[PDB]
Amino acid sequence: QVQLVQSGAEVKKPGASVKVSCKASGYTFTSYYMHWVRQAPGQGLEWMGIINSSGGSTSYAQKFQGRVTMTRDTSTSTVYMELSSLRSEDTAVYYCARPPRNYRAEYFQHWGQGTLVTVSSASTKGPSVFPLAPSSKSTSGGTAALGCLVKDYFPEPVTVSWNSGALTSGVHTFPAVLQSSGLYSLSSVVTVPSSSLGTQTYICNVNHKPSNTKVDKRVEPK
Amino acid sequence: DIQLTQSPSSLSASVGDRVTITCQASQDISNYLNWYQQRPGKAPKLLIYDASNLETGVPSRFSGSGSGTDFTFTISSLQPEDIATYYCQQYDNPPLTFGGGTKLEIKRTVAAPSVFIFPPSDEQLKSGTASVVCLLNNFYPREAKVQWKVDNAGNSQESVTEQDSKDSTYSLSSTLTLSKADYEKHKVYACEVTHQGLSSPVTKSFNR
């Protein structure tokens, strides 16, 4: 299947640059254009520009003229978007997207997973992961709630899974809140049968790519 | 640039309802107008291209029509998994532009929150801070109130999930943070939840 796997999230100081990669597979790289589209948190979609995988000629929206550079390596099927002289309002999820064959058809049939770029003076901190243990006070008629609390981390995001992706039903991972300390805290919870608490192990898998933190915490009853 | 104006901004409809969203272009763009679906946490997804063509693999309940300046997008039978923000996009003239988005929520039956409370873990207390977590699970509609009562009565934070694709509910996480000493001081930790599903506020508590 067609895959566009994008590089990881990162924080950059104002005035610095980011280079976001997008490795493509499952199709003939050079037969397709690649576009870039960005989205600031809680906002709409903004087109940045287009590169021809064949040859590398580029065209950019006026507002990024002079600070965006799109390139591509045809030998690694990778597309690069570099944004220079970063400003606060460059904080966004950046997407690569490919349209169909041209044989003008600019609708994006495939998207990357997005890369959060955060423009900040603050420095990267990994998270502390604490368990929210199932108790009689997190039980409700045979339904028990457990979770884990991912605290004091920067920048966004973290990904949480449960039992390495096996447990998907009943899972809520809440949007991160920005504490007074300038750091983010998040909680992930899951509801399970109270029957399960003695028989099944629950482990939350927290991953913070910017700080290269990968924690696996077992949550057990109190 | 070609502006795209989308309407409504947001809407709530019931499963099975027919839903139509409109896009207007600031000038003639013929039929170079696409529709994308952005579900919570996910990248956008092409549903309709060139005003009316249904992208391959997209359910038949999605349709689009129009030409020139006025376009429509229709969901013929609204499904719970259709919760999302929908965007139009023109490509008649660069720069490619998007509309502002239409947020589509599901209207369902009233659902009261399941309230749970979590004392701070031992590990976190070792570190000198205590976070108490109050969970309001699977409730509808979205408006909910949480008041923290420490010893039966300023620094809590709340967070609401997007509407759940499965059962169309919301969930809410509230966290009260304290120094280890201030936590060890008080005895009763409660969160009092008010919501339309409850005939009266529910207090869920624990004793340290």
Numbering used by the authors:
A (entry chain H): 1 to 52, 52A, 53 to 82, 82A, 82B, 82C, 83 to 99, 100H, ...
B (entry chain L): 1 to 153, 157 to 211
What are the paper's exact sentences on this?
The antibody COVA1-16 was recently isolated from an individual recovering from COVID-19 and cross-neutralizes SARS-CoV-2 (half-maximal inhibitory concentration [IC50], 0.13 μg/mL) and SARS-CoV (IC50, 2.5 μg/mL) pseudovirus (Brouwer et al., 2020). The heavy and light chains of COVA1-16 are encoded by immunoglobulin (IG) genes IGHV1-46, IGHD3-22, IGHJ1, IGKV1-33, and IGKJ4, with a relatively long CDR H3 of 20 amino acids. COVA1-16 utilizes a long complementarity-determining region (CDR) H3 to target a highly conserved epitope and can cross-neutralize SARS-CoV. Although its epitope does not overlap with the ACE2 receptor binding site, COVA1-16 is able to compete with ACE2 for binding to the RBD.
We further determined the unliganded structure of COVA1-16 Fab to 2.53-Å resolution and found that the CDR H3 distal region was not resolved because of lack of electron density, indicating its inherent flexibility. IGHV of COVA1-16 is only 1% somatically mutated in its nucleotide sequence (one amino acid change) from the germline gene, whereas its IGKV is 1.4% somatically mutated (three amino acid changes). The positively charged guanidinium of VH R100b also interacts with the partial negative dipole at the C terminus of a short α helix in the RBD (residues Y365–Y369). VH R100b is a somatically mutated residue (codon = AGG in the IGHD3-22-encoded region, where the germline residue is a Ser [codon = AGT]; Figure S1C).
